[PDB]
Amino acid sequence: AWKGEVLANNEAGQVTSIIYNPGDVITIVAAGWASYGPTQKWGPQGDREHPDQGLICHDAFCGALVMKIGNSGTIPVNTGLFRWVAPNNVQGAITLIYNDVPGTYGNNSGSFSVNIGKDQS
Amino acid sequence: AWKGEVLANNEAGQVTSIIYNPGDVITIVAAGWASYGPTQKWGPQGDREHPDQGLICHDAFCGALVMKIGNSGTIPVNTGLFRWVAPNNVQGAITLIYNDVPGTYGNNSGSFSVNIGKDQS
Ligand SMILES: O=[N+]([O-])c1ccc(O[C@@H]2O[C@H](CO)[C@H](O)[C@H](O)[C@H]2O)cc1
Ligand SMILES: O=[N+]([O-])c1ccc(O[C@@H]2O[C@H](CO)[C@H](O)[C@H](O)[C@H]2O)cc1
Ligand SMILES: [Ca+2]
Ligand SMILES: [Ca+2]
Numbered sequence: 001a002w003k004g005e006v007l008a009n010n011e012a013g014q015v016t017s018i019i020y021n022p023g024d025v026i027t028i029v030a031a032g033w034a035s036y037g038p039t040q041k042w043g044p045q046g047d048r049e050h051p052d053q054g055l056i057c058h059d060a061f062c063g064a065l066v067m068k069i070g071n072s073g074t075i076p077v078n079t080g081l082f083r084w085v086a087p088n089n090v091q092g093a094i095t096l097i098y099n100d101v102p103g104t105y106g107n108n109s110g111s112f113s114v115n116i117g118k119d120q121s
Numbered sequence: 122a123w124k125g126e127v128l129a130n131n132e133a134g135q136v137t138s139i140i141y142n143p144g145d146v147i148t149i150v151a152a153g154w155a156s157y158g159p160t161q162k163w164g165p166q167g168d169r170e171h172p173d174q175g176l177i178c179h180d181a182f183c184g185a186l187v188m189k190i191g192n193s194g195t196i197p198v199n200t201g202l203f204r205w206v207a208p209n210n211v212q213g214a215i216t217l218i219y220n221d222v223p224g225t226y227g228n229n230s231g232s233f234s235v236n237i238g239k240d241q242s
Pocket of ligand 1: 037051053104107
């Protein structure tokens with residue numbers, strides 16, 4: 001199991017020690033407060049009122065937690081995933097990323113605390 | 122394992138099928154959008170900017186997800202719990218509850234989708 005912080009201003013994302021293999025079942029829990037600029041802060045689901053202006057993941061709100069598995073496209077994580085199985089053709093190391101517009105991570109603040117575990121399968 | 126919705130306007134709380142027993146390790150993942158009154162909506166962590174005016178759980182923000190276990194007091198759940206063990210002498214059925222002031226649930230809206238499972242020990 002992996003546990004760590006994902007900083008909102010980390011454009012490259014946080015690499016985990018988790019390698020998703022075909023058939024794996026995983027659970028993720030994410031908590032905390034972060035911002036993509038404003039003085040306010042949002043949780044792992046991000047800001048539901050902010051328009052998508054070129055987010056790295058169009059399937060989640062700005063300020064949400066998302067992930068990549070290997071060289072996949074971005075996948076929404078939000079508050080987390082419960083005993084979750086990846087789509088076929090997806091496999092590799094899990095990198096966690098704060099959802100923002102590329103090149104704009106500089107003024108981000110806060111972070112999410114995240115646990116990732118592999119479940120029984 | 123249990124999966125279900127916890128309505129924000131349910132003052133009595135949502136009873137689950139989970140009975141917490143001594144030594145149990147559990148994981149919870151909660152997601153969604155709810156409100157304790159305003160047109161705006163907040164995730165499972167609630168509204169970090171709203172003052173506590175007599176909430177059923179003083180250890181969580183207004184609009185956060187909390188729980189009771191048997192006859193325990195309220196325990197914060199927020200976005201969820203990862204492989205979590207209960208405090209001493211805490212056991213019994215798990216009931217999930219939206220954190221609000223007693224007698225004011227009437228104007229609440231939305232809900233959280235919640236998964237609860239027991240982990241291997
Ligand atoms: O026009 N607004 O209401 C508005 C409010 C907040 C804004 O924050 C902006 O969001 C961008 C992403 O969408 C970038 O994250 C940028 O760093 C940030 O300042 C940008 C515009
Ligand atoms: O003083 N305010 O700014 C203020 C704004 C919104 C408020 O919503 C209020 O919150 C209460 C809990 O603290 C109750 O949930 C009440 O039903 C709700 O209308 C209550 C007060
Ligand atoms: Ca930003
Ligand atoms: Ca209310």
